[PDB]
Symmetry: C3
Subunit: 424 residues, 3 copies
């Protein structure tokens, strides 16, 4: 009886250890773990990304009118609260006299107003910004950019891909085979800053955001700055990330049928959620937001929409729920600078563009964007432990400890069935 009892106790301990590691692997499985696969796939044809940039000015000074104050000088830091010029201590002569010429406001008939007219006309001409465009050694045109509207205002996009245009591709690396543009930020047309404000942008330069053709730009939250007086080499590395759907990951695996973007991205969910909340509140929308809804005369931006953004970012954080898409494609960047002009390259530019050497020194940048090498990194989340390997590990453990199988369990049911006649 004793040796059989020892055999039985070893069977009990073996079954208990089997149950322990089996629960270990089950509890491992229902965490749905996932691991990371990195890759560096070289390829010949690479889609050159969409470049987007805003000048740090919202709008030029010479292209506003007494109209454009009289509706819109309230929000845009040009009036007082009682419709007059703010404290203009130590101002330039003609700079103040043109503004005071606009600041009569006497017997003024109003004009039927929109913010989109103002951001169209008072903004920057790209034909007065784009000095020299180059792409793969071929001269590109100012009409090849695309106008968008951001929080900064009228902004531009190269290689947008929209309006049926083919996405531009590169065939070689290096700084010569990229986008090489020469821009003039036009510091003579910046806003008068004799008023005091907490958001008074003392800086000068450009803000550039690199993004795919998929997503709309989000320059306020994603872009990087580029100063004038420097050619800026921007090394780019394409990264094709693939995430996972839930339970494993967090992907909006659907097509993402948003109201205003047929394609889906993380920024599109953001901008459409904030759009939808504002159209819910103030019956009209901001200029950087799409919609069939109208825009508002600018009292309703500082009166209605801005505190809706404040309670939206503060208290209504649950009102926007955005899942990251699966096949995201980002662009790593590496910024480096060289100074421009030289002591030899100055006088040619000054003769060429009819400006002073001071103007060339403090008003021109050269944005230079190119891939470092013709390869894209691939960051995929692989499912670490599928149901098949679960069945393999459980079956291996049950093969080791008890040695039984599902056939053995079913014949155990049949052996109980032959014992079931004794109970009845």
């Amino acid at each position: 009886s004793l040796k059989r009892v020892v055999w039985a106790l070893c069977f009990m301990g073996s079954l208990a250890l089997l149950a322990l590691v089996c629960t270990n692997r089950i509890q491992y499985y229902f965490l749905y773990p996932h691991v990371t696969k990195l890759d560096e796939v070289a390829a010949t044809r690479l889609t050159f990304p969409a470049v987007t940039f805003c000048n740090l000015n919202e709008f030029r000074f010479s292209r506003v009118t007494k109209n454009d104050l009289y509706h819109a000088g309230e929000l845009l830091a040009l009036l007082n609260n009682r419709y007059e010029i703010p404290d203009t201590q130590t101002a330039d002569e003609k700079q103040l006299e043109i503004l005071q010429d606009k600041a009569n406001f006497r017997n003024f008939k109003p004009k039927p107003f929109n913010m989109l007219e103002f951001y169209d006309r008072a903004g920057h001409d790209i034909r007065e910004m784009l000095l020299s465009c180059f792409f793969r050694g071929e001269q590109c045109s100012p009409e090849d950019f695309k106008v968008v509207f951001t929080r900064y205002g009228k902004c531009y996009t190269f290689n947008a891909g929209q309006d049926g245009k083919p996405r531009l591709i590169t065939m070689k690396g290096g700084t010569g085979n990229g986008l090489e543009i020469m821009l003039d930020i036009q510091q003579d047309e910046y806003l008068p800053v004799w008023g005091e404000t907490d958001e008074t942008s003392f800086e000068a330069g450009i803000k550039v955001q690199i993004h795919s053709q998929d997503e709309p730009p989000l320059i306020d939250q994603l872009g990087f700055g580029v100063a004038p007086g420097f050619q800026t080499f921007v090394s780019c590395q394409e990264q094709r990330l693939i995430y996972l759907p839930p339970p494993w990951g967090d992907c909006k695996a659907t097509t993402g049928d948003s109201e205003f973007y047929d394609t889906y991205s993380i920024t599109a969910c953001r901008i459409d959620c904030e759009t939808r909340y504002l159209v819910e509140n103030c019956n009209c929308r901001m200029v950087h937001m799409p919609g069939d809804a109208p825009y508002c005369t600018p009292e309703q931006y500082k009166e209605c929409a801005d505190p809706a953004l404040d309670f939206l970012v503060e208290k209504d954080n649950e009102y926007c729920v955005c899942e990251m898409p699966c096949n995201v494609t980002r662009y790593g960047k590496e910024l480096s600078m060289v100074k421009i002009p030289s002591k030899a390259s100055a006088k040619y530019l000054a003769k060429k563009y009819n400006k002073s050497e001071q103007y060339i020194g403090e008003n021109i940048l050269v944005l230079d964007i190119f891939f470092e090498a013709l390869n894209y990194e691939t960051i995929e989340q692989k499912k670490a432990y599928e149901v098949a390997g679960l069945l393999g590990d459980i079956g291996g453990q049950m093969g080791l400890f008890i040695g039984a199988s599902i056939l053995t369990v079913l014949e155990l049911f049949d052996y109980a069935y032959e014992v079931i006649k004794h109970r009845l």
Copy 2:
């Protein structure tokens, strides 16, 4: 006999292959492999990191005295070896006459000295550096910084979290919802550099290190530079790395009860090990090192402590053994620049701060630190092959090749036990 012999030879080869792949998986297991899990977890509340910065000057020139030479001009590149001014060829008039006014050294009674008095008084006032502080659009105060002492000297920290203060959080991305500070590096108060030295810092600007509230700053080895004349956008990405303990990884999994830091980090182990070695050697410690031990009058820094650092970094590399902690939180950064001021924003600053336009051109920077997006990357080392999957794979292999189990092995012992009576 033949068919049974073939069955036996196939059993032998099957057992040998089983032993081969079993040794393959065992040798795989005792390497303790581990793989990488990347994640991008979005969240609403993010702890804004601790910002720390040193001006590149060690101490202002106007706040030193004939005292401060007479003890301390030896180490601090202001005396000769025989207590006189070094070679001051092509010096400014009053700049040299004030130093020579300090350089009489005639009938000088000494003064009871410390290095901490000198770095307190001769350093930079933060109230004479911090022009405008902003955080989330709310104006922060100069009293909200914290004074620390580094190798560069008196340095400052925003959002330190110490002295029971709550760690500051952000609720939105973009450059407006971050830390926006305007600083004056005060190039008029830099050191006279008419002496020659190999460590003669010809540069000018600020050095900034971003770190968690956990670790003390290590600006000499971790910080990045920021030049004046540029608003510098600093994109930040929080990364929560989780490593593994040994055998798998290299983690000090304990609480790390260091003598001078209750919390544990890699920099704390470094600074306490170097502290402990110096308190072992020179009976007193440097200013950037904590301790209950005193400091030294500056002959003992260039006489005792510096070659202890030299043999410490060179020969005593085994005297400091620092393991990286488990749940490290780093901050990826991306630097971009825009130029400041504009041609419009100059005269307002010059009127505002009572300085020349040259002063604004070459003396002011704007440090701008913000998260790119409200998400933190997660780099975890998962154990690749635990003991449970080991038992599963071994049990699966033994289920395939020989088909036996541990029950079969124990009954093989019992079958030998029934054969054990034949031997005795």
Copy 3:
């Protein structure tokens, strides 16, 4: 009969599920998946990488001759098509009169020419560039650099490791324990740019590429720019990547016996493939390409070799097939800037180097390269699913569902063999 039939149907369904998940794991196996292992290994001795830099000028102006035009002014943007000066509108006086002095071309005997003589003599002296070299606080020498030839021309390399020199190592982090060099890009010696060109480099500064001693530099496609007037801190992080051979990965696992590089890299395959294609075409090679083949008088570069590069990059993309090597070692970099000189450090430099303060303001940079910390990241592709775990999972599944083994299959063959006598 019924209960046996139910046992048989459960055996059929169990066998079918077994076949399903078995095909799932086989199809998983022949994808050869691989996952990523990240590591951060700290170590004392780190090999300091090879630094390479080109001035953005190809060659100095004062070191060319009427010779050097008369052969070589055609390609090098100094002649017209009919051997005369291009449009020199708004030129400096002596700058144009020296060129016109070279531009007589009257009764000119030619001179036996090479491009390597011209890039040797007309380029930049490193002894007229390297103002102050420092490494680990020890002054390095201008003879410790190494001359190479790139597309930019005569370029230099620190810590090249070639000619039997030991690779330099660092023992401490921080900006003091790295390479600290002070350079003068010499904007007075840049090319006259009164001619118009699409590749007219208006910029000024230096281009620096950090690389291992293994690979030759590829500065046109890999380097980053550094402007003058800034000390540039370059944080470096060593990364030892290990890829996999095919089928798993894409590695040239062999030694890579290229014709001109005994060691193998990705850039070596590129430069030797383009070399081999050009030696196939124009019987002589460019200067940035190695070879026993000669070089060409410069009509054959703009006549033969450049369109061979054009059809090479465009149509002959299949003519170069380069696999990435296994144990690649890259160097992550992080660029930050501080301004140099100060208002105190100017006059010492101007007295020291016999130049104006304007010269110091717009002609000197300080390249500063150092490791952030004494640790290297390790990005290894581990094989995710080897043949051993395949046998374990299949054996576990066959242990679960049918419970059979390979012994059971062989005894099934023997049971068929006992049934094989009934057929014959």
